mmCIF file of C-alpha atoms in Angstrom:
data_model
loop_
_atom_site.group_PDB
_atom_site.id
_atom_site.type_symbol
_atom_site.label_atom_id
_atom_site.label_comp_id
_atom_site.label_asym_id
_atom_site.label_seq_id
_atom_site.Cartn_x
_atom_site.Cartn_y
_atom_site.Cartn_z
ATOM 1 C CA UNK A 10 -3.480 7.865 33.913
ATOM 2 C CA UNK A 11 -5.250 10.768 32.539
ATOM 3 C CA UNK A 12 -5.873 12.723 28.944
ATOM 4 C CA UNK A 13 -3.346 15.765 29.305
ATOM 5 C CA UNK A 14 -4.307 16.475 25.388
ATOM 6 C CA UNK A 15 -5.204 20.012 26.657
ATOM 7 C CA UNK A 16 -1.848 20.602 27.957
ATOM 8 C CA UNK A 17 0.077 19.851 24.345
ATOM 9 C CA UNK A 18 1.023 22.779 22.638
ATOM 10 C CA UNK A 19 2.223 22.696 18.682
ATOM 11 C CA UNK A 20 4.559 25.206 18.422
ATOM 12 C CA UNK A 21 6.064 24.421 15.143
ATOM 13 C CA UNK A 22 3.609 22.155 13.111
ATOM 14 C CA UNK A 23 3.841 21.217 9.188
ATOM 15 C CA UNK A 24 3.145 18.917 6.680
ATOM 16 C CA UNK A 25 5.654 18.318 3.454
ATOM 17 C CA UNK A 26 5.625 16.245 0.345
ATOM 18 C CA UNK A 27 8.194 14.397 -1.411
ATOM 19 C CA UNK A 28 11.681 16.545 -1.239
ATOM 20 C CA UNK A 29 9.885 19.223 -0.061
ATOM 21 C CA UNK A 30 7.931 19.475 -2.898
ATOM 22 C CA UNK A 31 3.910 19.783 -2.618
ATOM 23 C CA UNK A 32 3.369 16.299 -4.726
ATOM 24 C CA UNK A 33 3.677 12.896 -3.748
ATOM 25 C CA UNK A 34 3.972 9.668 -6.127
ATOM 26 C CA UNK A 35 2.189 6.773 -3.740
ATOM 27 C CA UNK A 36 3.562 3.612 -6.486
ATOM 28 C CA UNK A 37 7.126 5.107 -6.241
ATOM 29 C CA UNK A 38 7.318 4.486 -2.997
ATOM 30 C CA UNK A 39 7.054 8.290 -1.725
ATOM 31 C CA UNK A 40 4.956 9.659 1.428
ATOM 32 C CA UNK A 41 4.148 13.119 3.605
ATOM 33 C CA UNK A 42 6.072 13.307 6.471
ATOM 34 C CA UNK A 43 4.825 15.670 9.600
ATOM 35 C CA UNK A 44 7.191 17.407 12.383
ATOM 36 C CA UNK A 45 5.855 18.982 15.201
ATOM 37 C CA UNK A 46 8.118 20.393 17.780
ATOM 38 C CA UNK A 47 5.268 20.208 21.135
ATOM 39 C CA UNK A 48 5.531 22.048 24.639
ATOM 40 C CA UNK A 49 4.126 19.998 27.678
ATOM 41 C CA UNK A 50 2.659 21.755 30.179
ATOM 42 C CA UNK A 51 4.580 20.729 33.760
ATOM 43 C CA UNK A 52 3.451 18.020 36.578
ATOM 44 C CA UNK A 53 2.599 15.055 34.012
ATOM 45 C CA UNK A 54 2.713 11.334 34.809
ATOM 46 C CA UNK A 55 3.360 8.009 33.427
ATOM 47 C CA UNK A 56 0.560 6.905 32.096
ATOM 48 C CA UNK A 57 -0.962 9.858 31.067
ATOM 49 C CA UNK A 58 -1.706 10.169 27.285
ATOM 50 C CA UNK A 59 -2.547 12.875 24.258
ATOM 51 C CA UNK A 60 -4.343 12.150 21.212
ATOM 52 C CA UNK A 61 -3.713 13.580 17.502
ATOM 53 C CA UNK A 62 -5.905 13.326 14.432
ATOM 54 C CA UNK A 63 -4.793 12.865 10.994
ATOM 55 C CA UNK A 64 -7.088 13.373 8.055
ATOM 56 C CA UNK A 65 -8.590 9.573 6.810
ATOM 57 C CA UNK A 66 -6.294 10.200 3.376
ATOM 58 C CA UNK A 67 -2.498 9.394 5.316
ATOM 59 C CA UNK A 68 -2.176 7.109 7.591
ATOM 60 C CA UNK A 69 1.392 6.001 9.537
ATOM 61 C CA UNK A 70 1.655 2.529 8.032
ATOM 62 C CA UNK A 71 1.267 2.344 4.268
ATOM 63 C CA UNK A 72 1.468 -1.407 3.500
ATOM 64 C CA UNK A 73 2.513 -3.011 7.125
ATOM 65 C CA UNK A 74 0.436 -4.446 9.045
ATOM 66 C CA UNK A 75 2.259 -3.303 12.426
ATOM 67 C CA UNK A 76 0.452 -0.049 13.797
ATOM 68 C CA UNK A 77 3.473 1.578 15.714
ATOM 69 C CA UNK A 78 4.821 5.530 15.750
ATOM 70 C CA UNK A 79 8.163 6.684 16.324
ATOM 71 C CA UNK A 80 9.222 6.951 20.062
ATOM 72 C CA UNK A 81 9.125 11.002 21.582
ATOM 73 C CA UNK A 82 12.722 11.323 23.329
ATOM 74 C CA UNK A 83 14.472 13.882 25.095
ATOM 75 C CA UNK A 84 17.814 12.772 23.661
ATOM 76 C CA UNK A 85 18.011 9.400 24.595
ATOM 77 C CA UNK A 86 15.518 9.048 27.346
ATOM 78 C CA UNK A 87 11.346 7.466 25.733
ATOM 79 C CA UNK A 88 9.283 10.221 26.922
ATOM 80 C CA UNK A 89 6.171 8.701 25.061
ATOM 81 C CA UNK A 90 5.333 5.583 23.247
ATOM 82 C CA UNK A 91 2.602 5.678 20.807
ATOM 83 C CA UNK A 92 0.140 3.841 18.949
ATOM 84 C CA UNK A 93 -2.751 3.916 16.328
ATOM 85 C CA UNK A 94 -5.987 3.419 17.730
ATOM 86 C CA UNK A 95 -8.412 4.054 15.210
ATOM 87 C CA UNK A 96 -9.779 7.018 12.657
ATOM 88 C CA UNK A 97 -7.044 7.620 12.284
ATOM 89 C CA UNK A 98 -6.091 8.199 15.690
ATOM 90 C CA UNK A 99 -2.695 8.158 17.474
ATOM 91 C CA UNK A 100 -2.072 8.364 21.259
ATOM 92 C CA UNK A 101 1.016 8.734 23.254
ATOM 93 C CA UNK A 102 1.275 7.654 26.248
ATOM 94 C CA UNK A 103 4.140 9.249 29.149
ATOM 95 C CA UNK A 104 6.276 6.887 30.374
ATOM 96 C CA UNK A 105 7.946 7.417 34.430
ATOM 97 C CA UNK A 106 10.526 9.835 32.506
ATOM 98 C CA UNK A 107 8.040 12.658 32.266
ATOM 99 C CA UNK A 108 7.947 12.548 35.909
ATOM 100 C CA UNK A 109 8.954 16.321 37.897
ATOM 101 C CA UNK A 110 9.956 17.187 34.622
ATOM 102 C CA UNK A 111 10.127 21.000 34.077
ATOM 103 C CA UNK A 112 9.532 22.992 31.037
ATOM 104 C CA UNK A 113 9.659 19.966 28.409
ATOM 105 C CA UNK A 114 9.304 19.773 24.839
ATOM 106 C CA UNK A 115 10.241 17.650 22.213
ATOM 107 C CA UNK A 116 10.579 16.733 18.777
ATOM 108 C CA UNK A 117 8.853 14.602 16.396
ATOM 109 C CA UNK A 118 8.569 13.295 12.957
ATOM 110 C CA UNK A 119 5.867 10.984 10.968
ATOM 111 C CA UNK A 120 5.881 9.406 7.509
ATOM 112 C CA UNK A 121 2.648 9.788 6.141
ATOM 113 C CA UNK A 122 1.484 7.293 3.496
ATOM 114 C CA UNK A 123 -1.566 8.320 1.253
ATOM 115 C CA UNK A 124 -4.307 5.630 2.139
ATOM 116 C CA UNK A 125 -5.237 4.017 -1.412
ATOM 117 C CA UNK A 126 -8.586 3.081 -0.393
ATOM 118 C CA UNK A 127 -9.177 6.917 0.581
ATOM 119 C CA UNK A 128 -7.192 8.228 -1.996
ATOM 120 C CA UNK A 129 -8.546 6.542 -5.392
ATOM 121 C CA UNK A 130 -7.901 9.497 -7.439
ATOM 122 C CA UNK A 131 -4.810 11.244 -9.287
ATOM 123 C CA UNK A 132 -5.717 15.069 -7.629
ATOM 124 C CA UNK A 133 -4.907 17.647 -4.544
ATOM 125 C CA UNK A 134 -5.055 16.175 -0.871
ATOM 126 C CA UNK A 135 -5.682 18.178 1.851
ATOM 127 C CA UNK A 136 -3.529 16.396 4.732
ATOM 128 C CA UNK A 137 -3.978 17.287 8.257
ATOM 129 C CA UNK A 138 -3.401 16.705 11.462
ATOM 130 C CA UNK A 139 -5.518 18.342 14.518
ATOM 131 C CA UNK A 140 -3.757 18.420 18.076
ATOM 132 C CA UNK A 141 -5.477 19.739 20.793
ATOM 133 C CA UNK A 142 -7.352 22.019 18.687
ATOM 134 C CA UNK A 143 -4.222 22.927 16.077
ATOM 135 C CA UNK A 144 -4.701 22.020 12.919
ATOM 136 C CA UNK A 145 -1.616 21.885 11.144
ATOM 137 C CA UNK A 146 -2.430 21.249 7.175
ATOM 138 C CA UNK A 147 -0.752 20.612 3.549
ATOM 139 C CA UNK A 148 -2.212 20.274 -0.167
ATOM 140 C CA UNK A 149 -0.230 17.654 -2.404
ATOM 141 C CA UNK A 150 -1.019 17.008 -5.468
ATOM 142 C CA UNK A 151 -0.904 12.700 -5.960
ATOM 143 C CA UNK A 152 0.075 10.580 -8.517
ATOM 144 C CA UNK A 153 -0.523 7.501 -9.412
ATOM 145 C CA UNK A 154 1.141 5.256 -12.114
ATOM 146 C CA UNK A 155 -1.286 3.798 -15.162
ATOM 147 C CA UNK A 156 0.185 0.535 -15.350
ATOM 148 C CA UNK A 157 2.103 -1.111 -18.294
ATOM 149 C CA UNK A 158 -0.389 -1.988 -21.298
ATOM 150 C CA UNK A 159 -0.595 -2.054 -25.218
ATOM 151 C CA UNK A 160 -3.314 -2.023 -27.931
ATOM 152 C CA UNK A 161 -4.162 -5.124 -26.320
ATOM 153 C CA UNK A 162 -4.513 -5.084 -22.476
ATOM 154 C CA UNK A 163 -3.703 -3.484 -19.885
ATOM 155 C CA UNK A 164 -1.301 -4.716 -16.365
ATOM 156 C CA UNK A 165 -1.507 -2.796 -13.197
ATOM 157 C CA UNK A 166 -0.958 -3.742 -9.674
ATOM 158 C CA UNK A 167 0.617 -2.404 -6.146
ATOM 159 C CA UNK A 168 0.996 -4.513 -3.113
ATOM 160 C CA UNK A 169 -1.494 -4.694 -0.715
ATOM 161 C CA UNK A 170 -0.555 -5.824 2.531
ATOM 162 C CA UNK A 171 2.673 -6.574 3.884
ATOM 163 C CA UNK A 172 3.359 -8.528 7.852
ATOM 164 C CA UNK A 173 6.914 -9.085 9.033
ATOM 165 C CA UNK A 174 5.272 -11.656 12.179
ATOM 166 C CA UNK A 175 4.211 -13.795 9.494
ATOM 167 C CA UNK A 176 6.753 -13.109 6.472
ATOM 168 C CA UNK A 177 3.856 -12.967 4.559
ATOM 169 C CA UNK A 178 2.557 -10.366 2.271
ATOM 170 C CA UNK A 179 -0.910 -9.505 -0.004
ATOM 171 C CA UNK A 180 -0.594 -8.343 -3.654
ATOM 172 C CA UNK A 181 -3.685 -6.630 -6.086
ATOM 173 C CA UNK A 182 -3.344 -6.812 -9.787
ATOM 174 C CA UNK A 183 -5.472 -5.588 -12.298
ATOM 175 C CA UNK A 184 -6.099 -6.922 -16.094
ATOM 176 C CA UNK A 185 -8.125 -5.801 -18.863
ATOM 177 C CA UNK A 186 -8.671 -5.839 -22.132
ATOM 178 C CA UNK A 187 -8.279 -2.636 -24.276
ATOM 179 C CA UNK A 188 -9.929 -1.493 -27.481
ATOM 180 C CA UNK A 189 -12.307 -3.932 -27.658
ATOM 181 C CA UNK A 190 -9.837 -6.661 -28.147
ATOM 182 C CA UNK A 191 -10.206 -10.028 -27.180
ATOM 183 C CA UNK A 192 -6.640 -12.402 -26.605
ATOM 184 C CA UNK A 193 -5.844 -15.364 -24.692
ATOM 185 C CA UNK A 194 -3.565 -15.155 -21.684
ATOM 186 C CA UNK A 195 -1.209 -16.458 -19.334
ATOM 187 C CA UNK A 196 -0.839 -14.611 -16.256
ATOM 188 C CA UNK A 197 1.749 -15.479 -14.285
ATOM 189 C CA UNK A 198 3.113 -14.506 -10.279
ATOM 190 C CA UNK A 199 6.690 -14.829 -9.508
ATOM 191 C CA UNK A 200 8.922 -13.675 -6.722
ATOM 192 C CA UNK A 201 11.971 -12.438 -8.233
ATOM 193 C CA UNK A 202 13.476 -11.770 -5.098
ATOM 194 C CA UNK A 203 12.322 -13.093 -1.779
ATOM 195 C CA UNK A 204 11.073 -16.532 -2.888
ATOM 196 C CA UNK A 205 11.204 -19.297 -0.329
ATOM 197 C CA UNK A 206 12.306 -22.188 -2.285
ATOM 198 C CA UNK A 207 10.645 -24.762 0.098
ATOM 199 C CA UNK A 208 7.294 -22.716 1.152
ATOM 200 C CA UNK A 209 3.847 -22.984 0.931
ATOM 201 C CA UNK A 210 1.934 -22.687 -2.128
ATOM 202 C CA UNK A 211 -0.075 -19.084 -1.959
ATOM 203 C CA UNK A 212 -3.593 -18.420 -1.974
ATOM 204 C CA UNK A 213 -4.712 -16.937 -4.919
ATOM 205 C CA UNK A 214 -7.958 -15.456 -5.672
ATOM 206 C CA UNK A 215 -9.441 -13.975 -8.743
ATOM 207 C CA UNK A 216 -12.222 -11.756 -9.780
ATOM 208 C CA UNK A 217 -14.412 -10.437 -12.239
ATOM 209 C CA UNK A 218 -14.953 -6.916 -11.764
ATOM 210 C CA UNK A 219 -18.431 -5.833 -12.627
ATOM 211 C CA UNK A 220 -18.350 -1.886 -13.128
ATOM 212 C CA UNK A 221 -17.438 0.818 -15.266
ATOM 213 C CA UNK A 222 -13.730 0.769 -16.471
ATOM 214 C CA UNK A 223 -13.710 4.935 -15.534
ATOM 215 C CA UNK A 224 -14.359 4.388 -12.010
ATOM 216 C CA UNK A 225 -11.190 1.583 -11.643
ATOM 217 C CA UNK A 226 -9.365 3.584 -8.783
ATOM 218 C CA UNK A 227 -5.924 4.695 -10.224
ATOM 219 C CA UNK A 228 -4.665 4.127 -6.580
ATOM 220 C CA UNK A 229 -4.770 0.188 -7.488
ATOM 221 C CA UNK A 230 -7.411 -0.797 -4.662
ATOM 222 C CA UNK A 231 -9.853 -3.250 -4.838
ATOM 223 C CA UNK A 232 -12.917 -3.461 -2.379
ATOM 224 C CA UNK A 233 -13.227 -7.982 -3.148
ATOM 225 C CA UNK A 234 -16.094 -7.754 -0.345
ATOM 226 C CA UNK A 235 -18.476 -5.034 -2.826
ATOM 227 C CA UNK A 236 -20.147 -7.832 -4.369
ATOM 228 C CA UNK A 237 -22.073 -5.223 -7.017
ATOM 229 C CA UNK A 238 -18.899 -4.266 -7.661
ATOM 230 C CA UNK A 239 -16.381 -7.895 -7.461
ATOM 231 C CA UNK A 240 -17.458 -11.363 -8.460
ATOM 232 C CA UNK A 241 -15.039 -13.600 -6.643
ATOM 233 C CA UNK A 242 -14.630 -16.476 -10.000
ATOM 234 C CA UNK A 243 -11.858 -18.373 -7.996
ATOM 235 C CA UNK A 244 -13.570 -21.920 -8.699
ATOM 236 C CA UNK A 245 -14.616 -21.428 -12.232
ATOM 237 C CA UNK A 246 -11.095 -21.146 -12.857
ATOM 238 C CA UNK A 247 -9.387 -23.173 -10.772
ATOM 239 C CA UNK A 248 -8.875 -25.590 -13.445
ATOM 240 C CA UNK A 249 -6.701 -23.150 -15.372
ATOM 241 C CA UNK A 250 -4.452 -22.118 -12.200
ATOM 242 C CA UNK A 251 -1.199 -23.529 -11.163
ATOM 243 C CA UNK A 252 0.001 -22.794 -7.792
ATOM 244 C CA UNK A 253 3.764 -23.475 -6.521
ATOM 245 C CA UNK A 254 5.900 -24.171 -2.886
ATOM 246 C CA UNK A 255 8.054 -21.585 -4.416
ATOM 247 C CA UNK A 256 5.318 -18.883 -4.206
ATOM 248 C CA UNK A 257 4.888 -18.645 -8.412
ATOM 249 C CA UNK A 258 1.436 -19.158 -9.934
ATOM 250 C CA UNK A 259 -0.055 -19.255 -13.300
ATOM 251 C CA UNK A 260 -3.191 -19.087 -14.422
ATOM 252 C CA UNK A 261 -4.879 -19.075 -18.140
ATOM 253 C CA UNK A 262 -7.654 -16.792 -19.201
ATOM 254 C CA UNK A 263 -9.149 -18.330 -22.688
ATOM 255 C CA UNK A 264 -10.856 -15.037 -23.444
ATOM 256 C CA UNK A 265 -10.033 -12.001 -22.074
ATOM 257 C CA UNK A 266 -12.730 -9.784 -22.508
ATOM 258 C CA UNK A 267 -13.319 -8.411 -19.231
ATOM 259 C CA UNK A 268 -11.646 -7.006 -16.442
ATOM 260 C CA UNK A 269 -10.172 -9.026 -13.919
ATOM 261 C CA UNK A 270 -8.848 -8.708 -10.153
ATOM 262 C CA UNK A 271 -5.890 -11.417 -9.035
ATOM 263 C CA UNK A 272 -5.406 -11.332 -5.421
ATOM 264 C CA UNK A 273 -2.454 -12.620 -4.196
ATOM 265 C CA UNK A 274 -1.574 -14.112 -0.351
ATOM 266 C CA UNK A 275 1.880 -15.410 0.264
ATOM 267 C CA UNK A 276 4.984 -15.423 2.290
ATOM 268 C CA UNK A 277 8.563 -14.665 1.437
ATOM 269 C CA UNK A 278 12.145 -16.119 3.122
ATOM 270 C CA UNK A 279 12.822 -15.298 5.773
ATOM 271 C CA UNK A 280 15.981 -12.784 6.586
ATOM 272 C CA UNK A 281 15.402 -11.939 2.390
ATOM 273 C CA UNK A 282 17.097 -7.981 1.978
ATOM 274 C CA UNK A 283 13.396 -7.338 -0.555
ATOM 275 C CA UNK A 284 10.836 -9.331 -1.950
ATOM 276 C CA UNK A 285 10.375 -8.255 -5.867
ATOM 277 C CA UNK A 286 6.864 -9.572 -7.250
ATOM 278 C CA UNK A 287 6.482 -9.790 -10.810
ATOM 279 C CA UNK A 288 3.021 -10.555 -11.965
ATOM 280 C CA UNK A 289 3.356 -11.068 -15.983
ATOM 281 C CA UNK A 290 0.654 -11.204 -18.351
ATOM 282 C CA UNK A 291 1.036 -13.056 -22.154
ATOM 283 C CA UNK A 292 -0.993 -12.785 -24.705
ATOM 284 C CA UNK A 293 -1.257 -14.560 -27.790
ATOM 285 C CA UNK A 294 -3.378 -11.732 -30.110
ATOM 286 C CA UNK A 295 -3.403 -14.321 -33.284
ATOM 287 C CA UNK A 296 -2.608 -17.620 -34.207
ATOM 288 C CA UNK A 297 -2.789 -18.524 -37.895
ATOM 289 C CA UNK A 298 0.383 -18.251 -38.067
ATOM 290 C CA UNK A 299 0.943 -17.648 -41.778
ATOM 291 C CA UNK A 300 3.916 -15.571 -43.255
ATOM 292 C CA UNK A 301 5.527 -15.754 -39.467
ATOM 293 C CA UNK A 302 5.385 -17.039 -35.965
ATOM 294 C CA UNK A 303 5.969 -14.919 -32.751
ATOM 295 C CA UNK A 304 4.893 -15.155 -29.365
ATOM 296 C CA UNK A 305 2.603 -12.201 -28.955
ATOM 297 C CA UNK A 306 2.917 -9.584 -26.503
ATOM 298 C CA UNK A 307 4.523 -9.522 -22.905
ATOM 299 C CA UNK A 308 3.436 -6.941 -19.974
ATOM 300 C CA UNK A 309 5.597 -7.124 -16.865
ATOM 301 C CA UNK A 310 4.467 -5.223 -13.817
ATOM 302 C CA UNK A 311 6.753 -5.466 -10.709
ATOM 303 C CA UNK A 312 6.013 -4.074 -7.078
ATOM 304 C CA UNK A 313 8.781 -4.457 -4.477
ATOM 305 C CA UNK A 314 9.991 -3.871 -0.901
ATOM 306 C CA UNK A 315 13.322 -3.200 0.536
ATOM 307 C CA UNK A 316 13.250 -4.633 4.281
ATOM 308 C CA UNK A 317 17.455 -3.963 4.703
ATOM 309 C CA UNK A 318 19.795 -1.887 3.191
ATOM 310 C CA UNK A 319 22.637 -2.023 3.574
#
């Protein structure tokens, strides 16, 4: 069928932050959300389609790899299915339903996640969204967590990418040294929820990150493919890196004095209510052990998803 774009009217358009406020926090798990109530001009068929354009800082997925938008119903009847295309551009397409209908509109809402690799910054967005020549627009301010670090180091991470087909999901961590310290570590990967006791072991894949520590993009994003700015160190340390069928990993750092990316592949069980990865990092920041023995320090960084409740 044909591109009836032209014939969409926004007649109530807006863009909202978390609560209704005009921030967003990204790491605790909030998002935008659009509503648009459209008119349709009459004689439309199945088939036929109209495009909208969001601004490449939101997209409609966050971390899932599916690429499906909410259903447009009158009531109960699917009036339009959509789908993402591209940048960052989502069609609906008329099912037989819209057929001799007369003076339709409808209703919809979008969750708008703010796109870490566009959005590397703590700051004001600009969201919008342009149908058929509407723009309908929002400025949040974003913000991002720091992490969970000491005099010593520094933990961060987020997950990356997460695929219900494949009950698999991608996790980025960041470590680094602070104050010009250096300590020995143990980072570790475990899934404190979600681990499949008898699975395979996950790919893990580490990096040396080669820039400046100020440009380290408080979104948690890491571009592994930028080779001036990753250097993929995977077999010079495979030696010091454990992997396990229960997803868990551990690797040791003798000096950490740089910073370092650990990407993280794996799956989870199957039917699991939320997968909970903690990535911890210990350090031992002196060992003379004279006058007293501890064990050093401890940072514990966990990033999670809820797939039922409840």
């Amino acid at each position: 069928g044909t591109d009836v774009t032209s014939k969409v009217t926004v007649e109530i358009g807006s863009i909202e932050g978390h609560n209704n406020t005009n921030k967003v926090e990204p790491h605790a798990g909030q998002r935008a959300v659009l509503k648009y109530k459209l008119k349709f001009e009459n004689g439309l068929h199945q088939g036929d389609y109209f495009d909208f354009t969001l601004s490449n800082n939101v997209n409609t997925h966050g971390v899932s790899t599916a690429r499906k938008v909410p259903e447009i119903k009158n009531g109960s009847v699917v009036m339009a299915t959509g789908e993402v295309l591209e940048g960052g551009k989502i069609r609906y397409t008329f099912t037989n339903d819209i057929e001799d209908k007369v003076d339709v509109t409808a209703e919809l809402e979008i969750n708008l996640f703010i796109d870490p690799k566009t959005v590397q910054t703590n700051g004001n967005q600009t969201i919008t969204s342009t149908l058929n020549e509407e723009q309908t627009s929002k400025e949040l301010d974003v913000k991002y967590k720091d992490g969970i670090g000491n005099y010593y180091a520094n933990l961060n991470g987020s997950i990356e990418t997460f695929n219900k087909a494949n009950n698999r999901f991608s996790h980025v961590a960041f470590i680094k040294p602070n104050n010009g310290k250096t300590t020995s570590v143990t980072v570790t990967g475990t899934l404190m929820k979600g681990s499949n006791q008898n699975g395979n072991q996950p790919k893990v894949r580490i990096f040396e990150y080669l820039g400046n520590n100020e440009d380290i993009a408080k979104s948690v994003y890491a571009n592994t493919t930028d080779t001036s700015k990753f250097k993929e160190v995977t077999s010079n340390m495979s030696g010091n890196l454990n992997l396990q069928n229960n997803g868990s990993y551990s690797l040791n750092i003798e000096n950490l004095d740089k910073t370092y990316v650990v990407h993280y592949d794996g799956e989870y069980l199957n039917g699991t209510d939320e997968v909970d990865f903690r990535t911890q990092m210990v350090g031992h920041p002196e060992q003379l052990y004279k006058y007293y023995y501890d064990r050093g320090y401890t940072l514990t960084w966990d990033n999670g998803l809820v797939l039922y409740s409840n």
